[PDB]
Design a protein around this ligand. Structure first.
Ligand SMILES: *[B]([O])([O])[C]1[C][C][C]N1C(=O)[C]([N])[C]([C])[C]
Ligand SMILES: *[B]([O])([O])[C]1[C][C][C]N1C(=O)[C]([N])[C]([C])[C]
Ligand code: NA
Ligand code: NA
Lengths: 836, 836
């Protein structure tokens, strides 16, 4: 078997090749609104966010859903524009939400009035459509919400009880604004914008760093959905909000993007094993008169401290209100993230904030002892709680009961839907007796727990995946891996007598689906390895003999696929029975124009951390286009999902609990050795590895643990010390540093610098200089120990980049350097002559 | 001519070669004390700082100077130990003073009592020897100066008027302490140690960053040498001090050496074209009773503001008192550093600090209008003022006159000694009339200005070089370049009827000399290219017929040379007549074991900035040992002093005024082309360049301007934007940015990133990550523009290093990487095969 060597191009030639081979976000956030026009030809209008084309802002569009279609032809819904033609907190939110696009990122809608609310840059805007005032046939002018606030307004929400009122955050405090009267009012006085962040560490209505980065919670306040009528003809609007105190949280410095300043910005960063923010619940009570003017605002606090009413809770993972606004609900985690609670919180638990110790005691006594936190659900696990966005509360049927659907892996090790009924008993704890509550004084008895789904597959509840409940037919629509861990599909099931799960999406594609609130339509963004992404609308219907049974019918195209790219060869999905006892899936990019009797250099691209699956039946010709480019020059490219990756259940995910970095490369090498036994064109004497974040971390572990296998490792923004990473992520998978001294040591590449090769052209480190997620200190301290251990390294910095690469010139330089590095140190003939 | 290729060793082999080839500060700060022992065999005891041997702390030693010697034999003076067996402000001072050694860095001495004062780590210590109490024959126990101060005490000075009193700095305020009574007293209340540096930017008795880094001034307070007797039997001690306000000075962040913190330290850094600190003079008046107890301390300020009494002055370059303490003196610069003034300041210019506006006016009126600042000397230049340590005031002979020796380049363009007599006239400015002074109201008339030296050569007045004045014989001893710009020599001359300059040191060596206060002995640290450094004592004497004439005689050895190193071939000093009209000197390291008919790879080592001369007749086998190592592997090594380097006069130095970076590489290339025409073994198709600081700056300019000449450039801690460097240095050589837009642009490599090669393995950047002198931002912003211009680079960071390399593991890694980089990209056969 002859060694194939890649053509040795110059730096300028590789730049030109990359520019020539380089030469639009699909519609999303769908909403169905009924036309109610018996004589008219349309049943529904759909609204959605989309980019008008290749390079432009995201804006609001609408399309018309016809009552009937020509089933001979294919209907292309035309996009109608709904609308007429960054600060530091915007930049950081875009990092936390992983937003790459510009324009409207989300929108609020009040169905009763048809009021849209949305942020477009520095402005908060509103338009009206689909309400009682009817449906526009032309673009609407965005109405600017005027303000006296000097700084950026973030996170605007419409009051569901009254669409004249919005709330928003300004300098980490909650404000409200009436979009008819133009009354503007600050509700919380917790932060001072003039003060330094070392002095003022308090915020209201805001999700702090760990909850944006590690729990995908971006709001810290929630409108009560109903208003309380007053005897004066006015009403009371309520807002539940989280209040944070970050005083005890460590401050770290991250280089300012303005490099000319030679200054750093301060950041409240809870590193693993140190203090998370001090958190509590608060309620703002807004009294409004008959003509919509604010009478007074009463800020209210919990009758007893948060640490007493919610013993052992570190994180408020999720929160909201019950449908009729009777209770506030919250999903609460302990520090270990092995205990989840769903707790109902009555507004009667909140008393006015009072400094007068005489009046404060009068208010404490005015609240009954029967008013108590209600733990309606509590679960534990020896692996970890995976937080999700699934939680549905049915309308209150009986007085002292709550009926709800929740999802959990804790019973079977796979995420499944459960219908639960909890009894709201009076607690035997009485705070007037002047003691602390016993462990289970607020726990509710379970009247009923019914498994809706089950099996060796999971329901999805993150990244937009959720459920839709048909309360009439008593069905629940959900996304799952029931047919395959390589494809997401839409399913429907009864939650009354659960049994047969009907798949509503077509096999051979992975789907991401939105179901109409009216449960008679669904949209699917679908793709596979060979075909780029499409978006189609499907009408739902029941057979006349069985309303429980659901059928699908293609209705119209929303986005047409471009078709297979002219210059892209998709990879082949493969699999192998691992010695670990699991099927592990992989992707193989064969070198283009295979010559026989020749073995080729191999590049292993890796992530290998939790919360990600690289191998699945989706189109990889956009985000992983350059793996096809490597194959086009004569590199074998391999991707393998090792244990710890997602969509395979909690056991498979929990394989590296307490021992991150110790098991992943075994699977990666096992998959490489399986491939090389079946394929003789894989040269195992020229294997490179490359990844970003956890991928860069494992790229370093690969060269450290297995220099016998891996010639070169290119590690982007890698974790090198787990003590440097944050509480939410690190303690979930690795526990507290005191309870895992060996795991933290072995899992940290920087603590083992002397195990790297004493041989150059094998280790390349890449890092965004402004990275506030994986701090640059990970690289600088690894270099410190590499220099101290007399070890060679190559380094590239991206001075304008954080954790991701956003500036196209940085991306072009990264692709060019990496391609040139693989050529000179792995692929080319000169790379072979250099090895000593 | 065949190309010679260097042996291609592995990383591990080069590390071993460097370790095998790798396998003590000479005595300094000398002081002569007369024994006055007619019957005894010794005339003098000398005290000095030295390291006991190879690796140990610097401490105080003494040696005995015999009245007679055996002129047949060579006397080795034996070293007697005088003594019995870092904070952030210590680290930064060691950076500013370029101290590499540990232990006692300096010492104070009061001759009247024999009291030594010195700082050894966190302690201030005193011993007594050579006073009226006699001379020890054994080591003395250091007496700790006890304190209640919690933080490090810096810059301890003995009161010359009273050796019971010392002053020191603590948290940027002046304290005094009596080493007999143990009374301790804070004199200034200008700084709060508990406050953050953003809030409190004031200091007293301290030299700020630019004056430590760019003017070699490390103290900000000066004892008055005489005490004023009071009618009570007590006395008044005085301290002149500088008070600084850095409020308007820009704050920059430098990474903390504790990388685990991920924090940065704040630094007051006056970048070019921005505010220097607000400075003034202050006087502390300490009244002491008959038994040495403090009665009261009166802090005093100037009668009118500093900006009025010293119009146009930015920098207090130097300060002190006249011998009898009648006046304080100061050497003052304007911002452009083209105007120097020597100004006498009477204590009567200072009034008590008073808030009471009624009493303040009473004190202002109590001071006569005849009391005024006296400008005794003022000079200007169109190049720049070079500050030096030469300033001698003779004892006051007449009432309204001052007689002094100063040094200046402003008259002839070469630094020479001048004896000046100034008339202290009453100024016609009267402050009671309520106006501001006219430009020349404080200028004194020059009665007499006499050139003591002259010619195409300079007197030295920095880095320890100074004058010694024999007021009896009326001679002045000085160091100069009169015989050669490649050697420093000791000279003596009359300052009464100046004429013949007698050289007291032997040619064939460069000398650094200390003359006894008694002017009958001198010590020389001398070396040359072939012989490492020696230290010898020479007795001075006059012929019986002419006391003006001075002769030398070897007396004894202090430090014996080790002799020529066994594994070191010195370079050859060469020179060439430049097209610029100057002789330029160079150093050539021929490749070891020259083979004929073969051309070798060439490495040009460069500094090329102001204040440095690399080429001279000194031993280079210590600091530049690794240039010999490069020659031993087959590299031609070249060093050239381009225009702008020192020891050649102000015209030669002023060649790159306003155009730094534009002329240096022309000289370097001219010297290379001269060498290659005379020597055929120089391969001009394989030239590398390497330097640090200004050297790294010019290494980048070399690759940028002349990629036709230079294959590879390795730039350490380089200046890439002159706007990022400081006021004192940058504005001296380049002026204000507004007055030199093109010079700052062309002189900044980062503004011209698109002129670098689109060809890898040619540019290596090295930088200490903690560098507070040349900020790391120089490299990060250059990388930003290189990435944006699609240009390749190699990078090495030293995370534990500032501007210099102190940790030996960092130095070993730097030498190993550089040697390996030259092998792989310039010297070896593989380096030739790689070029596309
Ligand atoms: B990287 O994988 O993007 C980085 C290192 C570990 C986790 N992480 C993250 O950015 C995020 N905290 C998770 C949620 C992927
Ligand atoms: B480097 O040459 O050490 C650096 C860049 C320009 C001047 N400089 C200095 O460190 C110092 N400020 C001078 C005094 C050498
Ligand atoms: Na996130
Ligand atoms: Na200095």
């Amino acid at each position: 078997l002859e060694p194939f060597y890649v053509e040795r191009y110059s730096w300028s030639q590789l730049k030109k090749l990359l520019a020539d081979t380089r030469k639009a976000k699909a519609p999303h956030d769908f909403m169905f609104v009924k036309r109610n026009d018996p004589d008219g030809p349309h049943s529904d209008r759909i609204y959605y966010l989309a980019m008008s084309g290749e390079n432009r802002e995201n804006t609001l569009f609408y399309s018309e859903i016809p009552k009937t279609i020509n089933r001979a032809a294919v209907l292309m819904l035309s996009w109608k524009p709904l609308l007429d033609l960054y600060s530091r907190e915007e930049e950081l939110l875009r990092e936390r939400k992983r937003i790459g696009t510009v324009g409207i990122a989300s929108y609020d809608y009040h169905q009763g009035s048809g009021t849209f609310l949305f942020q477009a840059g520095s402005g908060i805007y509103h338009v009206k459509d689909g309400g009682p005032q009817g449906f526009t046939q032309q673009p609407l002018r965005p109405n600017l919400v005027e303000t006296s606030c000097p700084n950026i307004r973030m996170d605007p929400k419409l009051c569901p009880a009254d669409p004249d009122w919005i709330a928003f955050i300004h300098s980490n405090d909650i404000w409200i604004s009436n979009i008819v009267t133009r009354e503007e009012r600050r509700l919380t006085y917790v932060h001072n914008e003039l003060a330094n962040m070392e002095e003022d560490a308090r915020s209201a209505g805001v999700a702090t760093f760990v909850l944006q980065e590690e729990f995908d919670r971006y709001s810290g306040y929630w409108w009560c959905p109903k208003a309380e009528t007053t005897p004066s003809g006015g009403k009371i609007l309520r807002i539940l909000y989280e209040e944070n105190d970050e005083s005890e949280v460590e401050i770290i410095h991250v280089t300012s993007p303005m490099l000319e300043t030679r200054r750093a910005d301060s950041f409240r960063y809870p590193k693993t094993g140190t203090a998370n923010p001090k958190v509590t619940f608060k309620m703002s009570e807004i009294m409004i008169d008959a003509e919509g003017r604010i009478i007074d605002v009463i800020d209210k606090e919990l009758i007893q401290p948060f640490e007493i009413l919610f013993e052992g809770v570190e994180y408020i993972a999720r929160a909201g209100w019950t449908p009729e606004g009777k209770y506030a609900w919250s999903i609460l985690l302990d520090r270990s993230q092995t205990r989840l609670q769903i707790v109902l919180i009555s507004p009667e638990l909140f008393i006015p904030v009072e400094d007068d110790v005489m009046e404060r005691q009068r208010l404490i006594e005015s609240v009954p002892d029967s008013v108590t936190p209600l733990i309606i659900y509590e679960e534990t696990t020896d692996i970890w709680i995976n937080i999700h966005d699934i939680f549905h509360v049915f309308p209150q049927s009986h007085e002292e009961e709550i009926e709800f659907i929740f999802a959990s892996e804790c019973k079977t090790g796979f995420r499944h839907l459960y219908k639960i009924t909890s009894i709201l008993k009076e607690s035997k704890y009485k705070r007037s007796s002047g003691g602390l509550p016993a462990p289970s004084d607020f726990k509710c008895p379970i009247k009923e727990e019914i498994a809706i789904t089950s099996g060796e597959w999971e329901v999805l509840g993150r990244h937009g995946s959720n459920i839709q409940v048909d309360e009439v037919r008593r069905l629940v629509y959900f996304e799952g891996t029931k047919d395959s861990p390589l494809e997401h599909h839409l399913y429907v099931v009864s939650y009354v007598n659960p049994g047969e799960v009907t798949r509503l999406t077509d096999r051979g594609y992975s789907h991401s689906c939105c179901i109409s609130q009216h449960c008679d339509f669904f949209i699917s963004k679908y793709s596979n390895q060979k075909n780029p992404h499409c978006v189609s609308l499907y009408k739902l219907s029941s057979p006349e003999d069985d309303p429980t049974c659901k059928t699908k019918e293609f209705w119209a195209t929303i986005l047409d696929s471009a078709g297979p790219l002219p210059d892209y060869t998709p990879p082949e999905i493969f699999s192998f029975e691992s010695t670990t006892g699991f099927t592990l899936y992989g992707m193989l990019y064969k070198p283009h124009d295979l010559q026989p009797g020749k073995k080729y250099p191999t590049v292993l691209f890796i992530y290998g951390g939790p919360q990600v699956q690289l191998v699945n039946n989706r189109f990889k010709g956009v985000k992983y286009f350059r793996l096809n480019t490597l194959a086009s020059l004569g590199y074998v490219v391999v991707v393998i999902d090792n244990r710890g990756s997602c969509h395979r259940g909690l056991k498979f995910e929990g394989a590296f609990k307490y021992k991150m970095g110790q098991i992943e490369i075994d699977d990666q090498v096992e998959g490489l050795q399986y491939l090389a036994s079946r394929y003789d064109f894989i040269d195992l004497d020229r294997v490179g590895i490359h990844g970003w974040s956890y991928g860069g971390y494992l790229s370093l572990m690969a060269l450290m643990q297995r220099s016998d296998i891996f010639r070169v490792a290119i590690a982007g923004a890698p974790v090198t010390l787990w003590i440097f990473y944050d509480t939410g992520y690190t303690e979930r998978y690795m526990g507290h540093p005191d309870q895992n001294e060996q795991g933290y040591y072995l899992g940290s590449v920087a603590m083992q610098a002397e195990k790297f090769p004493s041989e150059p052209n094998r280790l390349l480190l890449l890092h965004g200089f402004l990275d506030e997620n994986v701090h640059f200190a990970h690289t600088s301290i690894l270099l410190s120990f590499l220099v101290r251990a007399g070890k060679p390294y190559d380094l590239q910095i991206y001075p304008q980049e954080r954790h991701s690469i956003r500036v196209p010139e940085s991306g072009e330089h990264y692709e060019l350097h990496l391609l040139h590095y693989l050529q000179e140190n792995l692929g080319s003939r000169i790379a072979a002559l250099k090895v000593i």
